[PDB]
Amino acid sequence: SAKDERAREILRGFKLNWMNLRDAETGKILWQGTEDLSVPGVEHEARVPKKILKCKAVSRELNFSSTEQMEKFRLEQKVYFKGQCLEEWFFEFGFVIPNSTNTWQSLIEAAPESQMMPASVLTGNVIIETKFFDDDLLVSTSRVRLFYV
Ligand SMILES: c1ccc(Cn2c(-c3ccc(OC[C@H](C4CCNCC4)n4c(-c5ccccc5)nc5ccccc54)cc3)nc3ccccc32)cc1
Numbered sequence: 001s002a003k004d005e006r007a008r009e010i011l012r013g014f015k016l017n018w019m020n021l022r023d024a025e026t027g028k029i030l031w032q033g034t035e036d037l038s039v040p041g042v043e044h045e046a047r048v049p050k051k052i053l054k055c056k057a058v059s060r061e062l063n064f065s066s067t068e069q070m071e072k073f074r075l076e077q078k079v080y081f082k083g084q085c086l087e088e089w090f091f092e093f094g095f096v097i098p099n100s101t102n103t104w105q106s107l108i109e110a111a112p113e114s115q116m117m118p119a120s121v122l123t124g125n126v127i128i129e130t131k132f133f134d135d136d137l138l139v140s141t142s143r144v145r146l147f148y149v
Pocket of ligand 1: 021037038048052053054058077079087110128
């Protein structure tokens with residue numbers, strides 16, 4: 001369909017340049033990466049400080065480029081523990097100018113009434129699956145395996 005072709009074109013022109021994650025309370029950068037974690041069909045790996053699990057809120061700064069215009073750029077993200085979804089997040093960026101480079105800031109909060117398992121239990125058993133959309137059009141699905149160090 002025209003929609004499937006369009007999703008492939010957006011993926012072709014898309015790149016995640018860098019990303020960092022901060023403790024939202026202190027503003028200190030806990031993790032930073034320049035690997036494009038959005039690339040589909042390969043399991044990405046990331047080693048993060050185990051103390052990030054104790055942050056109630058984590059602030060993300062995601063820098064991306066897009067050759068293609070997007071009307072409603074957004075993400076759906078699920079955290080899986082041994083294949084079971086523990087949590088889901090939705091974030092909306094909106095309009096993307098064709099051939100632009102943008103920095104997107106998000107606040108990722110803990111789900112209320114939930115207790116974090118120890119880092120030693122979680123390490124290597126957590127997969128964060130991210131779906132990139134333009135409105136209801138799925139552009140890509142990528143996965144990151146987490147190690148808490
Ligand atoms: C590094 C980290 C994560 C990614 C994946 N990734 C993200 C993303 C970032 C932070 C996220 O935070 C989710 C939680 C926080 C929530 C607030 N309280 C502390 C725990 N979290 C868990 C956790 C929650 C619940 C249960 C078990 C574990 N493991 C964590 C490990 C690190 C930080 C927070 C972690 C959720 C999604 N954006 C992306 C955009 C594009 C591509 C990939 C992207 C990539 C690299």
